[PDB]
Each structure stands twice: as structure tokens, then as C-alpha cells.
């Protein structure tokens, strides 16, 4: 929403968000709208990306099921939902849901530090092995 | 600091309930920290499991009779405090409180914060803490 003359909500707003709120932000599903309070007053993350970062399982579940949502949409630092999910070691079932929904198409996307989602998994982790199944 | 007891988030992320069972002598011990942070252990296994959203290890440990639900991290944080701070599901917070986490509801960390202070104002978590005497 129109906070600090931009499109900006913080982690406080997203932590308290319900599926009804996610639905009302439909025009914004592919838009960088969220950032942490500590950081600068420009949006960094999509709602899906911030939901993953804050472990909002019900909002993550709802958004991945949406028609018209770009699962490979980039954060302001050129990160995907898949990259963030791997970096934060979220449950393997969310990583699989991301990949099966079209996250596999962006599996070789690289962030500002030349890192892919595979590079964010630990050596021989269950995450590493799953990404290899989907073509990493 | 010793790497003798330290396990990091890489070890805990790959951990199963079989591993948690084998660590029983250590359930009240500061054993875990992130690679970015100090080599010195900060968190209990339950506390690290909550920070990494390991639902099966969290569910198993909360059921254990030998585990002190009010055990302190090295910076004097409880499982309840960390669960509130990381906005984890309400069911986990309620399980912690009913398990004896209500006895430590007014514990204050090194930054003079309680579990209530780590909840968002008017959240369902905030209201539940008030019910149990925050």
C-alpha cells in the first residue's frame, strides 16, 4: 500500500496477514511490495517471497495455487521464491510445491552474487537432491 | 565455544526424530548456533528446531517429559520467547504454554524483553499470552 510514498508493507503487516488479505492484493501478486523495517523504504520482496521468509504456511499454500502468479518473479536483488526457500531451509514439501508449480523453469536463475538455488542448498542435503530431480 | 558440543543450522536442518532421540542427555543444553554467529553454542535443540521451522522435531520434543520447557538460551531466551518472536503457528505457542511455558511467561531476556513484548500488538498470540498471565 501507499506508505512512505511507495508500494511498501513490512514484516509486521505480513506476519498478521490472512488468506483474505492475500486475495485482496491480487493486482500485486507479481510486484515487489515488502521489506523489513530495519532496511531502506523501497520494496524488496513479493508477497510469496515474504510469506516464505516469515513461514506463513497458509499464505504460501494459497499463493502457489493461484492462476496468474509468477512463481519465478525476482526480488529487487534478483532472487526467486525457490532461492529464498532453499537459503532459509524451509520444509522440503514447500520446495517441492514451488518446483512442481513452475519454479523448475527458473532453476538456473542467478542472483546479484552469481548464486543459483542449488548453490544455496548445503552439500548432500535433501534439498540438493530434490533440485537435481527437477533439472538443477 | 568448543566444536565438541556445537551443532550448526546445517546439522539441525537435516535432523530427524531418530537424531533428537539420541540427543536426550543434551535436551536442556545450549548446543546450537548459526554459522554466521559465534562458534559458542546459543540455543537448545527445541529452540533451534523452532527457529528453523522443523515441525516434526518441535512436535516430538514438546511431548517429552525429561525436557525443561523453560531452559534458557545463552542470551536468556525461552522456547516461548523465540516462538512468539518468530510468529510460529498459534498451536505451538499454546502447546508450549500448556507444557509449563506459562510458569516462565514473565522471564526477561538480556534486552529486558518478555515473550509478550516479542508478540505483535493485538495478535492472536498476544491475547493467548494474556490468558496465561502475561
Amino acid at each position: 500500500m501507499f506508505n512512505y510514498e511507495s508500494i511498501l508493507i513490512n514484516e509486521d503487516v505480513v506476519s498478521e496477514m490472512t488468506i483474505e488479505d492475500a486475495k485482496k492484493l491480487k493486482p500485486y501478486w507479481n510486484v515487489q511490495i515488502a521489506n523489513f523495517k530495519k532496511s531502506s523504504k523501497e520494496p524488496m520482496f513479493t508477497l510469496l517471497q515474504m510469506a516464505i521468509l516469515l513461514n506463513k504456511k497458509d499464505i504460501v499454500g494459497y499463493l502457489l495455487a493461484r492462476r496468474g502468479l509468477d512463481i519465478n518473479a525476482l526480488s529487487r536483488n534478483n532472487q526467486t521464491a525457490l532461492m529464498i526457500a532453499c537459503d532459509k531451509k524451509v520444509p522440503l514439501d514447500w520446495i517441492e510445491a514451488i518446483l512442481k508449480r513452475g519454479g523448475d523453469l527458473g532453476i538456473n536463475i542467478k542472483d546479484d552474487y552469481e548464486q543459483t538455488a542449488l548453490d544455496k542448498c548445503n552439500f548432500n542435503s535433501k534439498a540438493y537432491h530434490l533440485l537435481l530431480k527437477y533439472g538443477a
Side-chain angles (χ1 to χ4, degrees), chain A residues 1-4 6-19 21-23 25-37 39-56 58-66 68-113 115-122 124-125 127-132 134-136:
Chain A
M1 254 183 82
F2 185 58
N3 311 302
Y4 302 101
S6 64
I7 310 178
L8 224 208
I9 64 177
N10 68 23
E11 75 268 38
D12 297 351
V13 172
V14 171
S15 79
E16 291 311 301
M17 202 163 279
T18 69
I19 268 81
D21 298 315
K23 183 192 184 84
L25 295 177
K26 174 174 189 203
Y28 297 97
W29 283 345
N30 298 328
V31 178
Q32 293 156 18
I33 69 174
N35 207 359
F36 299 95
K37 294 185 99 291
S39 176
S40 80
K41 295 289 194 287
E42 25 179 322
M44 168 66 76
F45 299 110
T46 66
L47 181 68
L48 176 59
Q49 291 170 354
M50 196 61 82
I52 294 157
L53 245 15
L54 300 173
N55 292 330
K56 296 284 287 175
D58 296 317
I59 287 166
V60 167
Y62 171 77
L63 286 181
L64 289 174
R66 284 314 101 191
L69 188 138
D70 185 0
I71 312 282
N72 303 110
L74 296 186
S75 76
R76 184 155 46 81
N77 292 322
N78 291 319
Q79 287 195 302
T80 63
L82 178 64
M83 279 182 212
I84 287 159
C86 291
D87 183 74
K88 293 312 151 177
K89 310 133 178 290
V90 307
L92 193 62
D93 44 305
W94 303 11
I95 301 164
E96 194 152 22
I98 292 174
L99 291 162
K100 277 203 280 236
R101 289 291 191 168
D104 70 308
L105 295 179
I107 202 152
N108 288 119
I109 296 172
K110 70 192 169 58
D111 77 1
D112 283 343
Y113 282 77
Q115 305 289 288
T116 65
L118 191 60
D119 298 326
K120 320 279 201 174
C121 302
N122 288 310
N124 201 37
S125 66
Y128 185 95
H129 291 304
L130 183 69
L131 263 59
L132 289 182
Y134 287 87

